[PDB]
Design a protein around this ligand. Structure first.
Ligand SMILES: CC[C@H]1OC(=O)[C@H](C)C(=O)[C@H](C)[C@@H](O[C@@H]2O[C@H](C)C[C@H](N(C)C)[C@H]2O)[C@](C)(OC)C[C@@H](C)C(=O)[C@H](C)[C@H]2N(CCCCn3cnc(-c4cccnc4)c3)C(=O)O[C@]12C
Ligand SMILES: [Mg+2]
Ligand SMILES: [Mg+2]
Ligand SMILES: [Mg+2]
Ligand SMILES: [Mg+2]
Ligand SMILES: [Mg+2]
Ligand SMILES: [Mg+2]
Ligand SMILES: [Mg+2]
Ligand SMILES: [Mg+2]
Ligand SMILES: [Mg+2]
Ligand SMILES: [Mg+2]
Ligand SMILES: [Mg+2]
Ligand SMILES: [Mg+2]
Ligand SMILES: [Mg+2]
Ligand SMILES: [Mg+2]
Ligand SMILES: [Mg+2]
Ligand SMILES: [Mg+2]
Ligand SMILES: [Mg+2]
Ligand SMILES: [Mg+2]
Ligand SMILES: [Mg+2]
Ligand SMILES: [Mg+2]
Ligand SMILES: [Mg+2]
Ligand SMILES: [Mg+2]
Ligand SMILES: [Mg+2]
Ligand SMILES: [Mg+2]
Ligand SMILES: [Mg+2]
Ligand SMILES: [Mg+2]
Ligand SMILES: [Mg+2]
Ligand SMILES: [Mg+2]
Ligand SMILES: [Mg+2]
Ligand SMILES: [Mg+2]
Ligand SMILES: [Mg+2]
Ligand SMILES: [Mg+2]
Ligand SMILES: [Mg+2]
Ligand SMILES: [Mg+2]
Ligand SMILES: [Mg+2]
Ligand SMILES: [Mg+2]
Ligand SMILES: [Mg+2]
Ligand SMILES: [Mg+2]
Ligand SMILES: [Mg+2]
Ligand SMILES: [Mg+2]
Ligand SMILES: [Mg+2]
Ligand SMILES: [Mg+2]
Ligand SMILES: [Mg+2]
Ligand SMILES: [Mg+2]
Ligand SMILES: [Mg+2]
Ligand SMILES: [Mg+2]
Ligand SMILES: [Mg+2]
Ligand SMILES: [Mg+2]
Ligand SMILES: [Mg+2]
Ligand SMILES: [Mg+2]
Ligand SMILES: [Mg+2]
Ligand SMILES: [Mg+2]
Ligand SMILES: [Mg+2]
Ligand SMILES: [Mg+2]
Ligand SMILES: [Mg+2]
Ligand SMILES: [Mg+2]
Ligand SMILES: [Mg+2]
Ligand SMILES: [Mg+2]
Ligand SMILES: [Mg+2]
Ligand SMILES: [Mg+2]
Ligand SMILES: [Mg+2]
Ligand SMILES: [Mg+2]
Ligand SMILES: [Mg+2]
Ligand SMILES: [Mg+2]
Ligand SMILES: [Mg+2]
Ligand SMILES: [Mg+2]
Ligand SMILES: [Mg+2]
Ligand SMILES: [Mg+2]
Ligand SMILES: [Mg+2]
Ligand SMILES: [Mg+2]
Ligand SMILES: [Mg+2]
Ligand SMILES: [Mg+2]
Ligand SMILES: [Mg+2]
Ligand SMILES: [Mg+2]
Ligand SMILES: [Mg+2]
Ligand SMILES: [Mg+2]
Ligand SMILES: [Mg+2]
Ligand SMILES: [Mg+2]
Ligand SMILES: [Mg+2]
Ligand SMILES: [Mg+2]
Ligand SMILES: [Mg+2]
Ligand SMILES: [Mg+2]
Ligand SMILES: [Mg+2]
Ligand SMILES: [Mg+2]
Ligand SMILES: [Mg+2]
Ligand SMILES: [Mg+2]
Ligand SMILES: [Mg+2]
Ligand SMILES: [Mg+2]
Ligand SMILES: [Mg+2]
Ligand SMILES: [Mg+2]
Ligand SMILES: [Mg+2]
Ligand SMILES: [Mg+2]
Ligand SMILES: [Mg+2]
Ligand SMILES: [Mg+2]
Ligand SMILES: [Mg+2]
Ligand SMILES: [Mg+2]
Ligand SMILES: [Mg+2]
Ligand SMILES: [Mg+2]
Ligand SMILES: [Mg+2]
Ligand SMILES: [Mg+2]
Ligand SMILES: [Mg+2]
Ligand SMILES: [Mg+2]
Ligand SMILES: [Mg+2]
Ligand SMILES: [Mg+2]
Ligand SMILES: [Mg+2]
Ligand SMILES: [Mg+2]
Ligand SMILES: [Mg+2]
Ligand SMILES: [Mg+2]
Ligand SMILES: [Mg+2]
Ligand SMILES: [Mg+2]
Ligand SMILES: [Mg+2]
Ligand SMILES: [Mg+2]
Ligand SMILES: [Mg+2]
Ligand SMILES: [Mg+2]
Ligand SMILES: [Mg+2]
Ligand SMILES: [Mg+2]
Ligand SMILES: [Mg+2]
Ligand SMILES: [Mg+2]
Ligand SMILES: [Mg+2]
Ligand SMILES: [Mg+2]
Ligand SMILES: [Mg+2]
Ligand SMILES: [Mg+2]
Ligand SMILES: [Mg+2]
Ligand SMILES: [Mg+2]
Ligand SMILES: [Mg+2]
Ligand SMILES: [Mg+2]
Ligand SMILES: [Mg+2]
Ligand SMILES: [Mg+2]
Ligand SMILES: [Mg+2]
Ligand SMILES: [Mg+2]
Ligand SMILES: [Mg+2]
Ligand SMILES: [Mg+2]
Ligand SMILES: [Mg+2]
Ligand SMILES: [Mg+2]
Ligand SMILES: [Mg+2]
Ligand SMILES: [Mg+2]
Ligand SMILES: [Mg+2]
Ligand SMILES: [Mg+2]
Ligand SMILES: [Mg+2]
Ligand SMILES: [Mg+2]
Ligand SMILES: [Mg+2]
Ligand SMILES: [Mg+2]
Ligand SMILES: [Mg+2]
Ligand SMILES: [Mg+2]
Ligand SMILES: [Mg+2]
Ligand SMILES: [Mg+2]
Ligand SMILES: [Mg+2]
Ligand SMILES: [Mg+2]
Ligand SMILES: [Mg+2]
Ligand SMILES: [Mg+2]
Ligand SMILES: [Mg+2]
Ligand SMILES: [Mg+2]
Ligand SMILES: [Mg+2]
Ligand SMILES: [Mg+2]
Ligand SMILES: [Mg+2]
Ligand SMILES: [Mg+2]
Ligand SMILES: [Mg+2]
Ligand SMILES: [Mg+2]
Ligand SMILES: [Mg+2]
Ligand SMILES: [Mg+2]
Ligand SMILES: [Mg+2]
Ligand SMILES: [Mg+2]
Ligand SMILES: [Mg+2]
Ligand SMILES: [Mg+2]
Ligand SMILES: [Mg+2]
Ligand SMILES: [Mg+2]
Ligand SMILES: [Mg+2]
Ligand SMILES: [Mg+2]
Ligand SMILES: [Mg+2]
Ligand SMILES: [Mg+2]
Ligand SMILES: [Mg+2]
Ligand SMILES: [Mg+2]
Ligand SMILES: [Mg+2]
Ligand SMILES: [Mg+2]
Ligand SMILES: [Mg+2]
Ligand SMILES: [Mg+2]
Ligand SMILES: [Mg+2]
Ligand SMILES: [Mg+2]
Ligand SMILES: [Mg+2]
Ligand SMILES: [Mg+2]
Ligand SMILES: [Mg+2]
Ligand SMILES: [Mg+2]
Ligand SMILES: [Mg+2]
Ligand SMILES: [Mg+2]
Ligand SMILES: [Mg+2]
Ligand SMILES: [Mg+2]
Ligand SMILES: [Mg+2]
Ligand SMILES: [Mg+2]
Ligand SMILES: [Mg+2]
Ligand SMILES: [Mg+2]
Ligand SMILES: [Mg+2]
Ligand SMILES: [Mg+2]
Ligand SMILES: [Mg+2]
Ligand SMILES: [Mg+2]
Ligand SMILES: [Mg+2]
Ligand SMILES: [Mg+2]
Ligand SMILES: [Mg+2]
Ligand SMILES: [Mg+2]
Ligand SMILES: [Mg+2]
Ligand SMILES: [Mg+2]
Ligand SMILES: [Mg+2]
Ligand SMILES: [Mg+2]
Ligand SMILES: [Mg+2]
Ligand SMILES: [Mg+2]
Ligand SMILES: [Mg+2]
Ligand SMILES: [Mg+2]
Ligand SMILES: [Mg+2]
Ligand SMILES: [Mg+2]
Ligand SMILES: [Mg+2]
Ligand SMILES: [Mg+2]
Ligand SMILES: [Mg+2]
Ligand SMILES: [Mg+2]
Ligand SMILES: [Mg+2]
Ligand SMILES: [Mg+2]
Ligand SMILES: [Mg+2]
Ligand SMILES: [Mg+2]
Ligand SMILES: [Mg+2]
Ligand SMILES: [Mg+2]
Ligand SMILES: [Mg+2]
Ligand SMILES: [Mg+2]
Ligand SMILES: [Mg+2]
Ligand SMILES: [Mg+2]
Ligand SMILES: [Mg+2]
Ligand SMILES: [Mg+2]
Ligand SMILES: [Mg+2]
Ligand SMILES: [Mg+2]
Ligand SMILES: [Mg+2]
Ligand SMILES: [Mg+2]
Ligand SMILES: [Mg+2]
Ligand SMILES: [Mg+2]
Ligand SMILES: [Mg+2]
Ligand SMILES: [Mg+2]
Ligand SMILES: [Mg+2]
Ligand SMILES: [Mg+2]
Ligand SMILES: [Mg+2]
Ligand SMILES: [Mg+2]
Ligand SMILES: [Mg+2]
Ligand SMILES: [Mg+2]
Ligand SMILES: [Mg+2]
Ligand SMILES: [Mg+2]
Ligand SMILES: [Mg+2]
Ligand SMILES: [Mg+2]
Ligand SMILES: [Mg+2]
Ligand SMILES: [Mg+2]
Ligand SMILES: [Mg+2]
Ligand SMILES: [Mg+2]
Ligand SMILES: [Mg+2]
Lengths: 275, 48
RNA sequence: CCGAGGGUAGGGCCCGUGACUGGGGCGAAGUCGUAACAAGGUAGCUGUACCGGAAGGUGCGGCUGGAU
RNA sequence: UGGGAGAGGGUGGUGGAAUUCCCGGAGUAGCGGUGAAAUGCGCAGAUACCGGGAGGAACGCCGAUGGCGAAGGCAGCCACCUGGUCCACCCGUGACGCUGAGGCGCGAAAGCGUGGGGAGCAAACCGGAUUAGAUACCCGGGUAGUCCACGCCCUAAACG
RNA sequence: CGAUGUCGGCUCGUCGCAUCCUGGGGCUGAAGAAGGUCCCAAGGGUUGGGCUGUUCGCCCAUUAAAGCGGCACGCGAGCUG
RNA sequence: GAAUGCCGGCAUGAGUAACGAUAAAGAGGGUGAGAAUCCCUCUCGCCGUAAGCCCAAGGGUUCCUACGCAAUGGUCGUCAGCGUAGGGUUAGGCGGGACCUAAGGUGAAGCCGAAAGGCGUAGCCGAAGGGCAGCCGGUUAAUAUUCCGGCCCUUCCCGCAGGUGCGAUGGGGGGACGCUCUAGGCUAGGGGGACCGGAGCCAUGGACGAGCCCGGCCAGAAGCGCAGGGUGGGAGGUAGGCAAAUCCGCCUCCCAACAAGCUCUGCGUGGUGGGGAAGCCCGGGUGACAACCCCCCGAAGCCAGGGAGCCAAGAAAAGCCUCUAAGCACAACCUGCGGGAACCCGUACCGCAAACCGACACAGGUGGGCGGGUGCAAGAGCACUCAGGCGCGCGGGAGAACCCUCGCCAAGGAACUCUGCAAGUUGGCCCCGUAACUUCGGGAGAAGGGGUGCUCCCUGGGGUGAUGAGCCCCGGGGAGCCGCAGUGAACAGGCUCUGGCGACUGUUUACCAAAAACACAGCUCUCUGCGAACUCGUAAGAGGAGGUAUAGGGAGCGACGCUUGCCCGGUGCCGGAAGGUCAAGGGGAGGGGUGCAAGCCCCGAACCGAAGCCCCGGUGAACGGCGGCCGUAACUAUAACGGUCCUAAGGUAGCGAAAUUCCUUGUCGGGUAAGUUCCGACCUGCACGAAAAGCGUAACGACCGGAGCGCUGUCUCGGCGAGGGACCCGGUGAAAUUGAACUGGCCGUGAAGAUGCGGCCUACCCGUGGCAGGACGAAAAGACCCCGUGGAGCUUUACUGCAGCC
RNA sequence: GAGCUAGCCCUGGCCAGGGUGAAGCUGGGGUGAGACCCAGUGGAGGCCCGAACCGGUGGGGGAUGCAAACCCCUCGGAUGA
């Protein structure tokens, strides 16, 4: 339930912020934070390789547990639900009965005070991690390993979910957040339920400065440039594209598919995505 | 207005100094040429 | 001091009038088509929506004040 | 107090039929469509038949001239939550009643906002026919919308 | 073209006369007043505004009249832009 | 003898401009060969959130003293940041190093690259961040938290005493964190005192006074006091913190909880050590046994790691503590005391500037701290002033034009002009009051008005304290006084109506454009399933992102409102396992050369053979495109209607003479006395039109149009006045330019615009202040234009390659 | 060569004073409960006015300059991109 503002400035007229209603603890766990080296879109050559990055708020990285098969059979308790500026989802603090403490991304409906657990025999309950082959077909699921033990890869953005559509040998069929149908190995771990903070998609940044706070510097239209800069540059006055619309580097940007043809995972993409 | 020369001893030593030049093929040739010309000083003076 | 009223400024209501514009009423014998009245030749009417020179048409839902 | 009938309402679940699409099989010269046709689709293997899969919407027989609700309206099946109502006993209160300008709430469809969903259907739209024309009726496509949640709109041959 | 700054305005004049006014005349389809037309004449005079960068033009209110041209479309080592 | 030639010398312009902020000067007395310019005294003026003081950078002896004045100093010079010489910078505690990490850099391991080299974990380096022990006064010509004095403190080594399972690069805790708002108590700082200390003063009409003037502190160990921060205790279990672990983490139990207890800071007090004014007399000395006290204001600083709220969610590492392992428990560590030990570098001086950056002693540029008082609502604003520092390194006269900066102006009041450009007006506060329209915030400081000083009288509440006095802060009522005028000086909106554009705050062409351009939230299309796409790189490797389709790249559009039509024939992109074409390769009908021959060697048809292209479809918020002629209605006119040609389809809604309209000042209406502009209409739209978005839109704008009010020197139309210049005198003394010059007018001529030729006219020789018509005046080998088989940026379905991709 | 200038990275610092008065909180009213209304408190914002600071709008001066971009008046931002 994003919170609105009265129109007492030009920008508050449209700005919307998250209700933060589920967060129960407002400073992070000191044993699980580390400094996030801001890059600014520069690589190790010092060159911008991702344009229009830099200058957002300072952040600390919360170390997340994307391999829950780490602690098979060891129940943990949901101790807090916290704000993580490195991701759209909220995070959940687990106090394992071990005494060990860890962060997971917090699925929708998780409640501080409940227990969760990871393993082939865990209850089909929100927050539990199992190998894919043990979740009953039909269950929506998140934080999905793409290859066994390599770590949660799929469906981690706020409010996302993969659905289990069926089995086939060592492989289960998933409907990804993109709507694509892909085979994933049954031994790949995944966490029951969808990701929380579904209202994340309904936040209205409201002003330029809010984009600046996020580390997003202003984006310049190719049509606003000169020929030395961009295919859309130049022109007396304004100008339509005057050619197939292109990126700064020449390639076409409306419809041109760019997935590599002979990629080995093609044998595992069943249906390319929707909509 | 603010002009272009804004002396900075640490900047001067770290950019044009002896150890900067020796770390680099082009920097060493600079020393070889300034020594072959017989310059009384091979890198700029800066007081540290 | 109050004080007719005069002056300055800013409001409210009403009446007249205005290039041009909207439709309305009326007008013996104009042009277009034929929507309705018979099952009116696609039953009709309906609220709404969209479209079309025009009557209208079509969708969704409703009414019989519909026929056989 | 004890009872009853009921698509009354809200939430969550869940079952089979059918259409469409997809994969595999087998199979070949047409299919579909109409008043007659054409567009369309089909040897790049369609139609018709079999096995698998996905997904949406609606709920056949029961079903009635039936039932429920204040009206709009309500139809697979299961559970939970909740309304109204009827009967029997004649037990309690002792006129506490009727109506009702304002107000408040509910209010088919279509329509609007932000998300989602999208099988079928289908305004607009395109095409094929018909015709003097055909911005129609008929045919082949087809986008909103039809469906979900929340929020508006507040109309009707909202009729007995 | 080893540079002659290019419209208009403003300022400052000066000159030509094919004269707008004022002076003097002839003719008149000149009764008078008022005109028309041509001749002489350059002494002096020849307004203020609205519009437009404007020159030019139209318009408003006057006027004896509201002239037409040249001077590097006079005048940017005088100004404006 | 010429090359806008090169180098040098010297001229011309010229005793000309200028002598660098208009803060400002005058006199006396010194010194000296020489004095507006150096020294001293008195007077005057200027800064005073600086034009004063303290740091940091940078500079590098410029500091202090004596001795100098050739050059440097925009004049002078006895002076100086100049010349010569001598002197001058003192630290265990301040700063940096013998400590720590940050970006980054470097880099055993490892990876990559023709070579050079590029990466790279740990580790090392890296600071203005963390950590760490000194305060006050005195003293020098010049250094001082450094020397000296007083009182404090840190670390290291050794010894003694008491204690303790001691022990680390290993585990853990801590260090350790944002933004805005903010409590309580303090301190810095400041105001006042009828109290305390003081050399004196009584003027000029009055005052010997509860008079004037001056000052009334600073540092301090332990303890104590106040105010704050930090912090649960005990037990049992334990599988987690990459060995161990009594620590930490998790669970259970008991007890304690706004406390208290323990601990750590700040402030106060504190033994003790210092300071101490005006005035006067020659930096000193006296004052002086100086006094050193009360009240009020009060930080943005301190307690601090305080509290609250918020979303954009806010370094690391060491010191420190705790836990254990090897080990060792004659050790070792901890606590207290004692002695000893304690190194290297900086320290002068300038530091908003004459010592730094700008070629200059240059009106420019330069980060941090302190920055007093009074009044004006507040304040770092403004005026004046303290402390302190200056009068800007040419002067003296004069009182022309003209220029700059400034002041006033009769009557008029935008008539000025491209334009009210410029300049007036308005101007703070308090109160009354305030319109269309609106997204309900706003528009709003709307507009427009009233008030504003001083005296006396009465009175309400707060802060401190004690509830009282005093001090201080917010008010209310009443009666009066003066002036032209009471925010009496200074600082301080002119306002309204209406269009275009862009929603908005932002951003830009450093140095001619700040805008309607860019950006912007938001909207849509599209790519991307993660070793993602994409981007940089030969690679390795990075970025993307320690992210994962509610995410990330690309593209257009550009808040929001209502909307965004028709065309897929061509180009693009997407789909199509058929067909057609298609390279290397396969295949080898059949040929050719050569050898006596086996053979060797060469050419080679059918046919098999990818991507791409052709072909079949799809696709517009992909590139794009969205007709012509003729006829027609019972007045006329015009055509709702029709005929036909063409197209892939013929422009929908909305808008329209427009930031677009050529004809054009279209036509009509409005505003004006008059309106090529403006606003409102109409529509034959040369040549609007729907995300290169269409039409609107409250609010916003140093954007661009039109209008009105107010007020004005803009103007009619100018006048006077001020100061800085110009002018004259003394001092110093440039410049571009320059074939040489003994350099007039007219009418002609001349390469077509003559001081220089002809003919006439006119004209004694030389200057000074002025003005700009000429010398086709200066400046820059025309930017326009053309030419050169000159060059460069840029485009593409030009050519030909290359990356990349298939 | 990034000691100018552009962007980013790390770590520090700066923003006088005044005005406006969002959410929330509380109290009151309202209702079946609500929504909601009023008052108080509260202190939000690419909010408002205005120094420092950052800009460079209009005009004038300067133009062999004080200056190879300055000076005066005026004007924009000033808790934020
Ligand atoms: C104001 C001073 C300048 O004059 C003008 O600007 C003058 C008004 C002219 O324009 C002058 C008349 C020109 O000549 C004309 O050229 C035309 C092409 C042709 C003309 N005739 C031949 C017709 C000819 O006369 C020309 C070319 O000047 C460009 C002269 C040419 C010799 C120059 O370039 C000349 C050296 C100019 N210049 C470059 C200026 C650069 C730009 N700038 C401007 N202002 C600043 C500035 C501002 C503030 C602070 N600092 C700097 C910088 C200077 O430094 O000084 C100049 C003389
Ligand atoms: Mg809002
Ligand atoms: Mg509101
Ligand atoms: Mg939340
Ligand atoms: Mg840590
Ligand atoms: Mg990185
Ligand atoms: Mg690197
Ligand atoms: Mg990029
Ligand atoms: Mg970037
Ligand atoms: Mg989060
Ligand atoms: Mg994320
Ligand atoms: Mg897999
Ligand atoms: Mg979104
Ligand atoms: Mg951020
Ligand atoms: Mg973006
Ligand atoms: Mg952009
Ligand atoms: Mg452009
Ligand atoms: Mg451009
Ligand atoms: Mg470039
Ligand atoms: Mg290009
Ligand atoms: Mg282009
Ligand atoms: Mg362009
Ligand atoms: Mg154009
Ligand atoms: Mg352009
Ligand atoms: Mg376009
Ligand atoms: Mg084009
Ligand atoms: Mg292209
Ligand atoms: Mg590519
Ligand atoms: Mg896909
Ligand atoms: Mg600069
Ligand atoms: Mg610098
Ligand atoms: Mg340095
Ligand atoms: Mg440096
Ligand atoms: Mg370097
Ligand atoms: Mg070096
Ligand atoms: Mg080498
Ligand atoms: Mg070598
Ligand atoms: Mg040298
Ligand atoms: Mg030598
Ligand atoms: Mg060198
Ligand atoms: Mg009267
Ligand atoms: Mg009909
Ligand atoms: Mg009919
Ligand atoms: Mg009919
Ligand atoms: Mg239709
Ligand atoms: Mg076949
Ligand atoms: Mg589906
Ligand atoms: Mg009933
Ligand atoms: Mg009874
Ligand atoms: Mg309804
Ligand atoms: Mg058709
Ligand atoms: Mg026909
Ligand atoms: Mg009925
Ligand atoms: Mg020329
Ligand atoms: Mg020349
Ligand atoms: Mg020229
Ligand atoms: Mg020249
Ligand atoms: Mg007569
Ligand atoms: Mg007569
Ligand atoms: Mg005559
Ligand atoms: Mg005359
Ligand atoms: Mg002309
Ligand atoms: Mg004209
Ligand atoms: Mg006359
Ligand atoms: Mg006349
Ligand atoms: Mg003329
Ligand atoms: Mg002539
Ligand atoms: Mg000329
Ligand atoms: Mg001419
Ligand atoms: Mg001409
Ligand atoms: Mg001329
Ligand atoms: Mg001229
Ligand atoms: Mg000029
Ligand atoms: Mg001119
Ligand atoms: Mg000239
Ligand atoms: Mg001249
Ligand atoms: Mg000239
Ligand atoms: Mg111009
Ligand atoms: Mg010669
Ligand atoms: Mg020369
Ligand atoms: Mg030469
Ligand atoms: Mg030379
Ligand atoms: Mg020379
Ligand atoms: Mg020479
Ligand atoms: Mg010589
Ligand atoms: Mg010489
Ligand atoms: Mg000379
Ligand atoms: Mg001379
Ligand atoms: Mg002269
Ligand atoms: Mg000069
Ligand atoms: Mg000068
Ligand atoms: Mg000044
Ligand atoms: Mg002054
Ligand atoms: Mg004197
Ligand atoms: Mg002497
Ligand atoms: Mg002197
Ligand atoms: Mg002298
Ligand atoms: Mg002097
Ligand atoms: Mg002196
Ligand atoms: Mg002051
Ligand atoms: Mg430094
Ligand atoms: Mg120097
Ligand atoms: Mg000298
Ligand atoms: Mg001398
Ligand atoms: Mg000498
Ligand atoms: Mg000199
Ligand atoms: Mg000088
Ligand atoms: Mg010294
Ligand atoms: Mg010491
Ligand atoms: Mg040592
Ligand atoms: Mg190497
Ligand atoms: Mg280093
Ligand atoms: Mg270090
Ligand atoms: Mg440090
Ligand atoms: Mg230290
Ligand atoms: Mg101390
Ligand atoms: Mg111990
Ligand atoms: Mg911390
Ligand atoms: Mg941290
Ligand atoms: Mg920090
Ligand atoms: Mg914040
Ligand atoms: Mg103190
Ligand atoms: Mg005070
Ligand atoms: Mg254990
Ligand atoms: Mg004594
Ligand atoms: Mg501060
Ligand atoms: Mg603190
Ligand atoms: Mg705190
Ligand atoms: Mg680190
Ligand atoms: Mg052992
Ligand atoms: Mg032993
Ligand atoms: Mg040593
Ligand atoms: Mg020192
Ligand atoms: Mg300064
Ligand atoms: Mg100095
Ligand atoms: Mg000077
Ligand atoms: Mg200076
Ligand atoms: Mg004071
Ligand atoms: Mg004030
Ligand atoms: Mg002076
Ligand atoms: Mg000064
Ligand atoms: Mg001077
Ligand atoms: Mg004179
Ligand atoms: Mg002045
Ligand atoms: Mg006067
Ligand atoms: Mg006057
Ligand atoms: Mg007026
Ligand atoms: Mg007037
Ligand atoms: Mg005017
Ligand atoms: Mg105007
Ligand atoms: Mg004024
Ligand atoms: Mg004022
Ligand atoms: Mg006032
Ligand atoms: Mg009004
Ligand atoms: Mg109003
Ligand atoms: Mg208005
Ligand atoms: Mg309006
Ligand atoms: Mg309102
Ligand atoms: Mg007012
Ligand atoms: Mg007001
Ligand atoms: Mg008075
Ligand atoms: Mg103001
Ligand atoms: Mg713009
Ligand atoms: Mg703008
Ligand atoms: Mg717009
Ligand atoms: Mg808008
Ligand atoms: Mg701003
Ligand atoms: Mg510029
Ligand atoms: Mg430029
Ligand atoms: Mg430049
Ligand atoms: Mg400019
Ligand atoms: Mg601007
Ligand atoms: Mg721009
Ligand atoms: Mg833009
Ligand atoms: Mg915008
Ligand atoms: Mg939008
Ligand atoms: Mg979208
Ligand atoms: Mg590349
Ligand atoms: Mg990473
Ligand atoms: Mg916008
Ligand atoms: Mg745009
Ligand atoms: Mg609206
Ligand atoms: Mg097409
Ligand atoms: Mg097509
Ligand atoms: Mg196509
Ligand atoms: Mg072969
Ligand atoms: Mg085209
Ligand atoms: Mg086309
Ligand atoms: Mg339409
Ligand atoms: Mg028009
Ligand atoms: Mg017109
Ligand atoms: Mg228009
Ligand atoms: Mg046009
Ligand atoms: Mg026109
Ligand atoms: Mg025109
Ligand atoms: Mg006209
Ligand atoms: Mg009119
Ligand atoms: Mg017309
Ligand atoms: Mg355009
Ligand atoms: Mg508007
Ligand atoms: Mg603006
Ligand atoms: Mg603007
Ligand atoms: Mg006006
Ligand atoms: Mg007016
Ligand atoms: Mg004047
Ligand atoms: Mg004067
Ligand atoms: Mg004389
Ligand atoms: Mg002289
Ligand atoms: Mg001299
Ligand atoms: Mg000669
Ligand atoms: Mg001669
Ligand atoms: Mg002569
Ligand atoms: Mg002469
Ligand atoms: Mg000629
Ligand atoms: Mg001649
Ligand atoms: Mg002559
Ligand atoms: Mg001669
Ligand atoms: Mg001759
Ligand atoms: Mg002659
Ligand atoms: Mg002659
Ligand atoms: Mg003559
Ligand atoms: Mg002269
Ligand atoms: Mg001249
Ligand atoms: Mg010439
Ligand atoms: Mg001339
Ligand atoms: Mg000339
Ligand atoms: Mg040349
Ligand atoms: Mg040339
Ligand atoms: Mg040139
Ligand atoms: Mg030419
Ligand atoms: Mg050629
Ligand atoms: Mg040629
Ligand atoms: Mg060429
Ligand atoms: Mg070029
Ligand atoms: Mg720098
Ligand atoms: Mg500020
Ligand atoms: Mg609160
Ligand atoms: Mg602001
Ligand atoms: Mg304000
Ligand atoms: Mg300026
Ligand atoms: Mg600037
Ligand atoms: Mg101005
Ligand atoms: Mg200035
Ligand atoms: Mg100023
Ligand atoms: Mg201002
Ligand atoms: Mg402001
Ligand atoms: Mg402020
Ligand atoms: Mg910020």
């Amino acid at each position: 339930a994003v919170k609105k503002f009265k129109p007492y400035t030009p920008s508050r007229r449209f700005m919307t912020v998250a209700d933060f209603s589920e967060i129960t603890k407002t400073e992070p766990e000191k044993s699980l934070v580390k400094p996030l080296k801001k890059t600014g879109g520069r690589n190790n050559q010092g060159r911008i390789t991702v344009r229009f990055r830099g200058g957002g708020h300072k952040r600390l990285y919360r170390i997340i547990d994307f391999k829950r098969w780490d602690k098979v059979g060891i129940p943990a308790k949901v101790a807090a639900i916290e704000y993580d500026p490195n991701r759209s989802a909220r995070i959940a603090l687990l106090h394992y009965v071990d005494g060990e403490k860890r962060y997971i991304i917090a699925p929708d409906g998780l409640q501080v005070g409940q227990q969760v657990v990871a393993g082939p025999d865990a209850p089909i309950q929100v927050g539990n991690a199992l190998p894919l082959r043990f979740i009953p077909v039909g269950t929506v699921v998140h934080a999905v390993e793409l290859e066994p033990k390599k770590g949660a890869k799929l469906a981690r953005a706020a409010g996302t979910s993969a659905q289990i559509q069926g089995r086939e040998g060592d492989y289960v069929i998933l409907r990804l957040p993109s709507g694509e149908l892909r085979k994933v190995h049954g031994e790949c771990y995944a966490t029951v339920g969808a990701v929380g903070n579904a209202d994340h998609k309904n936040i209205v940044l409201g002003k330029a400065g809010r984009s600046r706070w996020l580390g997003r510097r202003p984006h310049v239209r190719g049509a606003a440039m000169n020929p030395v800069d961009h295919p859309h540059g130049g022109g007396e006055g304004r100008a339509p594209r005057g050619r197939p619309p292109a990126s700064p580097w020449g390639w076409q940007t409306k419809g041109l598919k760019t997935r590599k043809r002979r990629k080995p995972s093609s044998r595992f993409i069943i249906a390319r995505r929707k909509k | 207005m603010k002009r272009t020369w804004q002396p900075n001893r640490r900047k001067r030593a770290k950019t044009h100094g002896f150890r900067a030049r020796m770390r680099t093929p082009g920097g060493r040739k600079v020393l070889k040429r300034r020594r072959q010309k017989g310059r009384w000083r091979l890198t700029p003076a800066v007081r540290k």
